[PDB]
Amino acid sequence: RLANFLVHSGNNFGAILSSTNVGSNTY
Amino acid sequence: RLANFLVHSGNNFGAILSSTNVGSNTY
Amino acid sequence: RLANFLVHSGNNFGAILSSTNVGSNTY
Amino acid sequence: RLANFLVHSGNNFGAILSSTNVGSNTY
Amino acid sequence: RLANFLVHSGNNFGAILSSTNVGSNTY
Amino acid sequence: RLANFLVHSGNNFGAILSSTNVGSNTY
Amino acid sequence: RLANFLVHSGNNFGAILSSTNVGSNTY
Amino acid sequence: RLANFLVHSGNNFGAILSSTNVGSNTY
Amino acid sequence: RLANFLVHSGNNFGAILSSTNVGSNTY
Amino acid sequence: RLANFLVHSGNNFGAILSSTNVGSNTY
Amino acid sequence: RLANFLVHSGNNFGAILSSTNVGSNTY
Amino acid sequence: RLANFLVHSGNNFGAILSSTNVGSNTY
Amino acid sequence: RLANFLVHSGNNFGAILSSTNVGSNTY
Amino acid sequence: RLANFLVHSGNNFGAILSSTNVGSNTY
Amino acid sequence: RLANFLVHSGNNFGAILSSTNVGSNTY
Amino acid sequence: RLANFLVHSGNNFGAILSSTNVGSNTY
Amino acid sequence: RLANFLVHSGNNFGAILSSTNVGSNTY
Amino acid sequence: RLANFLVHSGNNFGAILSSTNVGSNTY
Amino acid sequence: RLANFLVHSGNNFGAILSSTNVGSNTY
Amino acid sequence: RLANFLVHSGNNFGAILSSTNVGSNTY
């Protein structure tokens, strides 16, 4: 019985320019 | 019994320019 | 019994310009 | 019985320029 | 019974330029 | 008056998400 | 008056998330 | 008046997250 | 008046996070 | 008046985090 | 003999959000 | 014989959020 | 015979957040 | 015969947050 | 015959936070 | 081949500006 | 081949500006 | 091949500015 | 090959500025 | 090959500035 939790809650990102893999969940 | 949770809740993104894989879930 | 959850709830994206894979679910 | 928690809650990011792997969860 | 907790709560990032692996959880 | 209630009394093996926008300017 | 209540009394094996925006300018 | 209450009385084996934005300018 | 209460009376084997933004300028 | 209360009376084997921003300029 | 020149030539504006008096000429 | 020159040529603005009097000419 | 030159040429602005009087000419 | 030169040429500004009178010409 | 030169050429500004009168010409 | 020429041989008391975009992605 | 020429042989009492973008990604 | 030439042979009492962007990523 | 030439042979009583960006990542 | 030449043979009573960025990461 294996449970994996990847959560993003209430996060604020003002500006994202020329970026990669920002605020993401990767399994 | 395996459960995988990838969640995005209440996240704010002001501006995204020329970016890749922003605020995404990848399995 | 395997359950996979990829969820996007209540997320705000102000502006997306020349970007790829923004706010998406990929399995 | 193994549980893995990767959580991001209430984090503020003012500006992200030419960056990689910012505020992300990687399993 | 093994539990692993990687948490980010209430963290503020003013500006991130040309950086890698900032404010992220890696398992 | 605004009342926002989320109640859970059973056994939950899935995801339960609630998003509400009242009198706001959101985009 | 604003009342935001989240109540949990059962057994939870999943994720329960609540996001609320009241009288705010969000983007 | 603003009242924000999170109550947990059962047995929790998962994640319970609550995010609230009241009268704020967020982006 | 602002009242922010987090109450836990059961047995918790997971993560319980609460984030609140009241009358603030956040980005 | 501002009242911020965190109460724990049960047995906790996990993480309980609370983040609050009242009348502040945060980024 | 009075000559006033207010000129805007070849300027690029990627994204403008919730702003005032951007790239304008005022006499 | 009075000549006043206010010129903006070839300027790039990536992202402008919640700003005032950006890249403008005022006489 | 009075000549006043206020010039902006080839200037790059990556990100401007919550700012005033950026890259402007005021007479 | 009076000549006043205020020039901005080839200047790079990575990120400007909560600032005033940045890279501007004032007469 | 009076000539006044205020010049800014090829200057790089990485990050400017909560600052005043940065990289500006004042006459 | 690309040839961009600006030639001035007379007496100029005004502003002469030239902007060119060749094979570029501009926004 | 790219040739960018600016030639001035007369008497100039004004401003002459030239901006060129060739094969570039600009925003 | 790239050739950028600025030639001035007359009498200049004003401002002559030249800005060029070739094969670059600028923002 | 890249050739950047600035030539001045007359009498200059003003400002002559040249800015060039070749094959660079600038912001 | 890169050749950057600045030549002055006349009488200069003003300012002559040259800025060049070749194959660089600048911000």
Author numbering:
A (entry chain I), B (entry chain E), C (entry chain A), D (entry chain M), E (entry chain Q), F (entry chain C), ...: 11 to 37
Paper text:
The fibrils present after 6 weeks, which represents the growth phase of fibril formation, are strikingly different to those observed at the 3-week time point. More surprisingly, and in marked contrast to the single structure solvable to high resolution at 3 weeks, six distinct fibril polymorphs could be identified at this time point. However, four fibril structures could be solved to high resolution (3.1–3.4 Å). Larger fibril assemblies accumulate as assembly progresses, both in terms of the average repeating crossover length of fibrils and the average number of subunits per layer of the fibril, i.e., the number of proto-filaments in each fibril form. For example, 36% of the dataset shows 4PF fibril structures in the 22-week plateau sample compared with 11% and 0% in the 6-week growth and 3-week lag phase samples, respectively.
IAPP forms amyloid deposits in the pancreas of >90% of individuals with T2D.43–45 A single genetic mutation resulting in a serine to glycine substitution at residue 20 (IAPP-S20G) is associated with familial, early-onset T2D.46,47 Recently, cryo-EM structures of IAPP amyloid fibrils assembled in vitro for the wild-type (WT)48–50 sequence and IAPP-S20G48 have been determined, as well as those of patient-seeded WT IAPP.
